[PDB]
Design a protein around this ligand. Structure first.
Ligand SMILES: CC(=O)N[C@H]1[C@H]([C@H](O)[C@H](O)CO)O[C@@](O)(C(=O)O)C[C@@H]1O
Ligand SMILES: CC(=O)N[C@H]1[C@H]([C@H](O)[C@H](O)CO)O[C@@](O)(C(=O)O)C[C@@H]1O
Ligand SMILES: [Ca+2]
Ligand SMILES: [Ca+2]
Ligand SMILES: [Ca+2]
Ligand SMILES: [Ca+2]
Ligand SMILES: [Ca+2]
Ligand SMILES: [Ca+2]
Ligand SMILES: [Ca+2]
Ligand SMILES: [Cl-]
Ligand SMILES: [Cl-]
Ligand SMILES: [Cl-]
Ligand SMILES: [Cl-]
Ligand SMILES: [Cl-]
Ligand SMILES: [Cl-]
Ligand SMILES: [Cl-]
Ligand SMILES: [Cl-]
Ligand code: NA
Ligand code: NA
Lengths: 56, 264, 281, 264, 281, 56
């Protein structure tokens, strides 16, 4: 049950096998590049178009 | 015809209008909702009071002066004595609620000033004695609709028994962080030249699906003068700030006799 | 996925005005350079890999220093030096705490690592054989030791680790153990509702997370009986949150902590150094 | 949402905004452009400095008072000491340029007044001695960013040597024509009740494809108070007028050592 | 791939003259033996494997020697012996430096290895329990320790390695961390432009790479508290460039270094030993 | 994700698996026999043919 994944590039793959029956034992979660800044930077009810006036 | 400045909000038998709004905030981009079966916890059929309780309640107004340092409330505390919402809250062990918060402050085209209006999850504040930590009385933590005020000075008590209230120090947001960073919380600004109201729609926020409303406030509401009120003909003028809040998608579990909290 | 590349743009003369907005709305400024200057095309190959939550928290941080000793104890005070108990927390130190407190709620598994060190108390009392340590996790409710060699250390059900001095730092993983659906870093409330006319004390009660949190106790002993030479030990406890999720960001701690709460100290509430003038480069 | 009153202009690393504009003028309906091969004259590969020079330069501001008679500048003279535009201008024998001219003057809803803003090709002005004709010194003709002012009186000099400057007589537009007819030139009006800025986009205008910038100004910029500034609480108040100009589609030929004009 | 084989060739009598050239052009001589002698065929199976950059640099080289001690310090000077800080560099030693300086620019990952040794300071003060070391990498900006047991060592975010005396030499990899697209071994310039009539000092300013380089600090301590016996330690730091690229070759250093720059020393600028005569075999 | 490669001959293959998620952790780069001495030994604009005169 080996997982082969891309490495973070340096100056290209690596292999992982989980040895333990509890997921808590696992190494770090894989890089998660998810983001949605707008839930904090623009949490407005009505859409604001940049090129338009903010208030009309 | 339609405008970012003009809005109507109707909940239950109550309606708000504003003609100088600035859009509206939906905290974290999430509208409130009822608790889904796949996230539920207590198993008794809940009470969902709907229009009896999910409606606008207007708190006592406060006065904005050139010397005001700001105001705070907690939720659901501020609404605990409000009509049927308060009754449903206290007859049940558990409750959850979202809110529409509408803060109102009009002036004139010749006045100036700006209020930051922030909704803060788990708004834990500092106590006012250095003989103890986390040393705040239930009564002082839960002022109800009168809320509290910020100060620009910190004067902790000589004796521990006299400092069991919040040290609501404005520039540290009453909690040891710089007020300039409060914008990471859902917020609007009432800048008198631009708008006369702020509207924030809040989902239920907690690490649990449902919790004890009489023990635990989910949100703080903070109003801070970012730029002081000024009016040239009378620098000592005062203008009201009025806070009107509607519970939304209220749901209660664990019915029994009524909770009557200590008052002193 | 990469951070944003910059498109080739020239100038404008237009009724489109992306430079203006109204932050009263609760929206932050949104404009980017292409909106307000002429830009070249620049391909951005750089990524935000090291600022993901897993990357930000992906470090073992020291959270406390415990002390235990091994010698022939003849007084109550000295008997209590033969073992130690510690309520598990991240508030004894400031660095990991401050990072966690960028957030209101979190959910993670924990890697715990320990660094154990010794020194001789004196040189005129011979030597000491290599010591084995027991670190026992006592969940809330389980009996706590009152002596280093009482029955609790048999640890039939509590997890214990036996560590041999000089071996690699011991390490174990702990699942997300919260009784809620996430950990709360802040709790604006109390453990019970005080009721009208009750006789329960309201003058010495506390507020916030301290009234509801309990992650159990770490108990540590030297398993060996005493040598003629007294040995004193330190146990440094390290925590790394892994498999991390967090919710509801907060301004970070701006002034020194003075305990487990959010309280601040009167002589330490002036973080900014005043500038000479508003026009100081 | 979009409006004749709200505009953004970006050139190079510089941006202007206005929220009380009145459209914009494109002189003679023609946007500036580079010189086509079929209209070219000097044969050396030209320098086209693009963003280094084709950007907004803000001149020293002037003060509009109830007694002001008006202001003039010449172009490219007014920009001769402006960053890389000035350097490219003086290192070359030949140059051509269009412009975006943005004149700025805000006040209040209680002030009144109107400025005529005119772009005049070949703005030749009268001299100030009647002992000679066309008798103006290079230095007085080319004041640079400070420009000059109009007067409501004509007082020619007793001696020819003392009158080698323009007789900038307002109602004759400094050149023997009635100012009321200046509207035949590309123009806007800044009428304080309506707008706070004027924007004129100018193509290169000349009887040649390209010419000696240090010898010859292609455009005059004239700002005349058509209706005087008035403000009831203080008739002696002054409000700034700020002129910001961007070269456009600049093209230069005949590179050599730098031109350093006489200063006295 | 192999080095060049030699073809079978005889003699010539020809207008083709490969023996002559003109090095004024900037070209080196190009002629090979087959151009100027009669050659047999020789198949060349030999390779240039060991002179690839990876092979040339594929060694862990000592770059510095640090010292730390563990004893009961009662003076400021002795307290400062309980930990050490070192600005990370390859200029404390000469061998790796000289090899790197065959090139103007480089790009590589780094393997860092450490060798840690101890001795007793004296024999009349008993003994000492086995010591654990902390080696903490402090990137530019992170707080530097002022005492061996201050808060900085909790190392929530800085990488630290805890090493147990007697264990295998510790080792870690470091990525290419340069803020440019390659490391510069030489920088013909300054960190800022001094401007006309400014009051900033121009008499004590420096030149070159020293004005712009900063790879942070290594901080080392013994984690143990003091024993009666004072222990003194050395930490040797080793670097191996790996995954190496280099650009723009240079003549190698011909005379002794006298510091971090290219400066030379007046008593050591005569590398050649004079020959007796131009005709000396 | 095992890589099997030729060994350097002695007086014939070996196996490598990468264990770490960062390429910086990897062992030495494989032998790279690339070379172009002419960029240093003959960086001339106009081609020089050995058998021809260097200057004509
Ligand atoms: C912790 C500590 O300071 N221990 C010190 C002891 C004790 O002070 C006395 O033995 C107690 O009486 O004294 C020494 O001289 C010793 O025994 O060699 C040095 C040693 O470091
Ligand atoms: C570093 C060093 O030279 N240490 C030496 C010490 C010290 O000089 C004195 O103890 C200090 O007073 O003296 C010895 O005779 C000893 O203690 O056995 C030998 C030992 O090698
Ligand atoms: Ca906009
Ligand atoms: Ca119902
Ligand atoms: Ca642009
Ligand atoms: Ca023991
Ligand atoms: Ca031959
Ligand atoms: Ca130490
Ligand atoms: Ca030749
Ligand atoms: Cl109330
Ligand atoms: Cl036991
Ligand atoms: Cl034993
Ligand atoms: Cl300063
Ligand atoms: Cl000028
Ligand atoms: Cl520590
Ligand atoms: Cl220790
Ligand atoms: Cl010789
Ligand atoms: Na990109
Ligand atoms: Na060969």
């Amino acid at each position: 049950g080996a997982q082969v994944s891309s490495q973070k590039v340096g100056a290209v793959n690596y292999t992982t096998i989980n040895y333990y029956k509890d997921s808590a034992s696992n190494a770090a979660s894989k890089l998660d590049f998810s983001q949605d800044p707008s839930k904090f930077t623009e949490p407005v009810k009505d859409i604001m178009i940049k090129t338009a006036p903010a208030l009309n | 015809g339609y405008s970012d400045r003009v809005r109507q909000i109707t909940l239950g038998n109550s309606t708000i209008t504003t003609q100088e709004a600035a859009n509206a905030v939906v905290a974290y981009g999430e509208w409130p909702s009822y608790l889904d079966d796949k996230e539920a916890n207590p198993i008794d059929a809940p009470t969902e009071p709907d229009v009896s309780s999910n409606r606008f309640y207007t708190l006592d107004s406060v006065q904005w002066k050139s010397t005001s340092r700001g105001w705070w409330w907690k939720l659901p505390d501020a609404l605990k004595d409000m009509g049927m919402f308060g009754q449903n809250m206290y007859y049940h062990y558990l409750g959850r609620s979202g809110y529409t918060v509408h803060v109102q402050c009009n002036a004139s085209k010749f006045h100036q000033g700006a209020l930051g209006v922030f909704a803060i999850p788990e708004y834990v504040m500092a106590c006012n004695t250095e003989a103890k930590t986390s040393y705040v009385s239930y009564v002082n933590a839960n002022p109800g609709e009168k809320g509290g005020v910020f100060d620009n000075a910190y004067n902790p008590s000589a004796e521990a028994s006299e400092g069991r209230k919040f040290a609501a120090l404005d520039y540290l947001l009453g909690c040891g962080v710089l007020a300039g960073n409060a914008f990471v919380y859902p917020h609007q600004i009432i800048n008198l030249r631009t708008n006369n109201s702020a509207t924030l729609v809040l989902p239920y926020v907690n690490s649990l699906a449902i919790d004890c409303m009489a023990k635990h406030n989910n949100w703080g509401l903070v109003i801070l003068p970012l730029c002081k009120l000024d009016y040239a003909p009378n620098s000592s003028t005062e203008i009201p700030i009025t806070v009107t809040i509607a519970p939304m998608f209220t749901e209660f579990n664990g019915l029994r006799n009524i909770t009557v909290p200590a008052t002193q | 996925p990469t951070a944003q590349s910059t498109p080739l743009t020239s100038g404008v003369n237009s009724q489109e005005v992306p430079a203006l907005t109204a932050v009263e709305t609760g929206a932050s400024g949104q404009a980017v350079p292409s909106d307000v200057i002429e830009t070249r095309h620049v391909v951005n190959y750089k990524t935000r890999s090291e600022s993901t939550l897993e990357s930000f928290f992906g470090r073992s941080a020291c959270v406390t220093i415990l002390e235990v000793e091994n010698f022939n104890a003849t007084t109550d005070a000295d008997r209590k030096k033969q073992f130690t108990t510690w309520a598990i927390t991240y508030t004894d130190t400031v660095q990991l705490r401050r990072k966690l407190e960028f957030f209101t709620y979190s959910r993670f598994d924990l890697e715990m690592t320990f660094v154990i060190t010794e020194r001789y108390y004196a040189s005129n009392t011979g030597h000491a054989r290599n010591q084995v340590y027991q670190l026992m996790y006592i969940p809330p409710g389980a009996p706590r030791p009152t002596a280093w060699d009482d029955y609790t250390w048999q640890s039939s059900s509590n997890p214990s680790v036996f560590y041999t001095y000089g071996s690699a730092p011991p390490r174990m993983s702990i699942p997300y153990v919260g009784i809620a659906n996430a950990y709360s870093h802040f709790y604006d409330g109390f453990a019970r509702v005080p009721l009208k006319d009750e006789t329960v004390d309201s003058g010495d009660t506390y507020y916030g997370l301290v009234t509801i949190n309990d992650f159990g106790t770490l108990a540590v002993r030297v398993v060996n009986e005493y040598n003629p030479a007294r040995i004193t030990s330190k146990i440094r406890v390290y925590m790394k949150p892994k498999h991390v999720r967090c919710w509801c960001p907060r301004p970070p701690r701006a002034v020194p902590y003075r305990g487990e709460g959010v309280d601040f100290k009167q002589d330490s509430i002036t973080p900014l150094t005043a500038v000479e003038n508003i026009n100081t480069f």
